């Protein structure tokens, strides 16, 4: 005797030792991405080509 | 006996140890930019070429 048994309800494992169908279907995926920059530019100049008489001290 | 059940309830995890599949989707993006310029450019001149006598001593 195998106990009580259900008719219309889907077959299911209820006890020990009964077997279950796993379908393995693993679909996983992870990304991460990152940047940092920094940038400084300076040019400075001051030319004298020619200097009138009154400022040739300076 | 594992209590009372409900019939047209959605199943839902309700005491320790019941189970809930997460669906893991994450999309999360950060971005930030900043720039700054300053620009100053200055030419002068002064020329005599040709200086009448009256103006010569100036």
Do not use: H, W
Request: no cysteine; net charge positive; glycine share 8%.
């Amino acid at each position: 005797n195998y106990g009580y048994q259900p008719l219309f309800e889907d077959r299911r494992p209820r006890n020990i030792g009964d077997t279950l169908t796993i379908v393995l279907q693993e679909n996983v995926s992870a990304s991460k991405s990152s940047s940092a920059n920094a940038s400084r530019d300076g040019k400075t100049s001051f030319g004298f080509d020619t200097v009138p008489r009154y400022l040739q001290g300076l």
